[PDB]
From a paper:
Human leukocyte antigen class-I (HLA-I) molecules are responsible for presenting endogenous peptides mainly generated by proteolytic machinery on the surfaces of cytotoxic CD8+ T lymphocytes. We employed a well characterized HLA-A*11:01-EBV restricted peptide ATIGTAMYK derived from BRLF1 protein product Rta (134–142)28 to investigate the stability of HLA-A*11:01 molecule in complex with shorter peptides (<8-mer). To elucidate the structural basis for the two short peptides occupying the same peptide binding groove, the crystal structure of HLA-A*11:01 in complex with two short peptides, namely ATIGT (5-mer) and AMYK (4-mer) was determined at 1.66 Å, and was compared with the structure of HLA-A*11:01 in complex with the 9-mer full-length ATIGTAMYK peptide resolved at 1.35 Å.
Furthermore, the crystal structure of HLA-A*11:01 in complex with two short truncated peptides at 1.66 Å demonstrates that they can bind in the same orientation similar to the parent peptide. In contrast, the two short peptides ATIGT and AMYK adopted a bulged conformation, whereby, the N-terminal peptide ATIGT contributing P2 anchor residue (P2-Thr) and C-terminal peptide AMYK contributing PΩ anchor residue (P9-Lys). Instead of forming a direct hydrogen bond of Gln55 on α2 helix, P5-Thr of N-terminal peptide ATIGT flipped over and is held by forming a direct hydrogen bond with Asn66 on α1 helix. Likewise, P7-Met of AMYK has moved to the exterior by 2.5 Å in correlation to the equivalent P7-Met of ATIGTAMYK. Furthermore, the head of P8-Tyr of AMYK peptide is slanted at an angle by 3.8° in contrast to the corresponding P8-Tyr of 9-mer peptide, where the head of P8-Tyr in 9-mer is parallel to the peptide binding groove helices. In comparison to 9-mer structure, the peptide residues P5-Thr (89.5 Å2), P6-Ala (96.5 Å2) and P8-Tyr (97.4 Å2) of dual peptide structure show maximum amount of solvent exposure and their side chains are pointed outward of the peptide binding groove. Furthermore, P2-Thr interacts with Glu63, Asn66 and Arg163 via framework of two water molecules. On the other hand, P2 anchor residue threonine of N-terminal peptide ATIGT in dual peptide structure is stabilised by similar bonding pattern as P2-Thr of 9-mer structure, except that it does not make any water mediated interaction with Asn66. In comparison with the 9-mer structure, the C-terminal peptide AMYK in a dual peptide structure is held stably in a similar manner in the F pocket by corresponding PΩ anchor residue P9-Lys except that carboxylate makes an additional direct hydrogen bond with Lys146.
Numbering used by the authors:
A (entry chain B): 1 to 99
B (entry chain C): 1 to 5
C (entry chain A): 1 to 274
D (entry chain D): 1 to 4
Write the structure that this text describes.
């Protein structure tokens, strides 16, 4: 059985240009556990990204949080790129700060 | 505390 | 004011790439407090909440022992199960284990659990009586017969009604300031036109603990799912949670819609309207 | 001792 990840990319706090915050990519509901998640700034992979310890839900599917400190600005675009066996190509979800 | 103890 | 303690173990084979990977995590309610990762350099059980850090060297040694032992057990079991299912040596497979206990507001034992999966499907589970097992398939029936012969349910019961509960109580006391807190949601609404005839309303809940929450959109006082989206509750990264629920509405009809927010930290449920 |  394979289960594709549900992907959310979001800031810890509502974003305000110039104010320090955390950029999160939460991946949940996936199986198997092998996954690669990168946070992107203007298309480039961010180097210092940390992640949570692997855990799972009642239906045995996995979840992980990936995160980095950042300061949003008007011009910088952020995204999360998720690579999983269920995804023919990595899925790239753009951060929408006004949801 | 984990099981095992 | 019921509380739970849960451990979650994952073992994943990676043929030709080293030994299986083993990860363990522990939680009290929705707060993680320990981890172990077989690929990390420490090879120790490590703290992940401030209130566990006071535990002494004996505790860390014993916890490290226990999870190392499970990692080694699982290496045997991965081989066994590949044989039961007639699988090749070349594929990656996964064992997952969850166990733990629930206590009441009085701190007394309510319920214990132990359940095991293989490749993300049920494999075997301890029943709620803590005396018997349910096997999901014919391979797990082999395990079930071994485990009855081994009296394994008694050893699990002794832990779940004993040590599990005792340590859950201790953590609830030591971490009281944060574990016994409720943080109610901070709520707001957003509103975006999407065409000349529709707009999106999104009801947000931020900063809440514990994670359990309900968000519901209503039209004319009736719960609705037509043209709604509800995301999974997600971690903020600071120990609290977030969720949102959205509805697409006919332009000009926003005032017919209400978002209802239910959470343990609220004196009464909130009704939000644009 | 518990082995599957």
């Amino acid at each position: 059985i394979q289960r594709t990840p549900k992907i959310q990319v979001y800031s810890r706090h509502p974003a305000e240009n110039g104010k320090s915050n955390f950029l999160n990519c939460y991946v949940s509901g996936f199986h198997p556990s092998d996954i690669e998640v990168d946070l992107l700034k203007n298309g480039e992979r961010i180097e210092k990204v940390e992640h949570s310890d692997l855990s799972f839900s009642k239906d045995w599917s996995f979840y992980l949080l990936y995160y980095t400190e950042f300061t949003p600005t008007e011009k910088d675009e952020y995204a999360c790129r998720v690579n999983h066996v269920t995804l023919s190509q990595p899925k790239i979800v753009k951060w929408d700060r006004d949801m | 505390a984990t099981i095992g103890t | 004011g019921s509380h739970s303690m849960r451990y979650f173990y994952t073992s994943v084979s990676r043929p030709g790439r080293g030994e299986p990977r083993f990860i363990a995590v522990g939680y009290v309610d929705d707060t993680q407090f320990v981890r172990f990762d077989s690929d990390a350099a420490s090879q120790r059980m490590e703290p992940r909440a401030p209130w566990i850090e006071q535990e002494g060297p004996e505790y860390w040694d014993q916890e490290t022992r226990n999870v190392k032992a499970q990692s080694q057990t699982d290496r045997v079991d991965l081989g066994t199960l590949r044989g039961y299912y007639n699988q090749s040596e070349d594929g990656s497979h996964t064992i997952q284990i969850m166990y733990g206990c629930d206590v009441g507001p009085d701190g007394r034992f309510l319920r214990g659990y132990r359940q095991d999966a293989y490749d993300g499907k049920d494999y075997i589970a301890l029943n709620e009586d803590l005396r018997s097992w349910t096997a999901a398939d014919m391979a797990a029936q082999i395990t079930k017969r071994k485990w009855e012969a081994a009296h394994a349910a008694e050893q699990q019961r002794a832990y779940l009604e004993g040590r599990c509960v005792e340590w859950l109580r201790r953590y609830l006391e030591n971490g009281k300031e944060t574990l016994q807190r409720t943080d109610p949601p901070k709520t707001h609404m957003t509103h975006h036109p999407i065409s000349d005839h529709e707009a999106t309303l999104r009801c947000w809940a931020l900063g809440f603990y514990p994670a359990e929450i309900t968000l519901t959109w209503q039209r004319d006082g009736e719960d609705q799912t037509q043209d709604t989206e509800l995301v999974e509750t997600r971690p903020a990264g600071d120990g609290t949670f977030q969720k949102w629920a959205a509805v697409v509405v006919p332009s000009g009809e926003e005032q017919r819609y209400t978002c209802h927010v239910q959470h343990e930290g609220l004196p009464k449920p909130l009704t939000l309207r644009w | 001792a518990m082995y599957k």
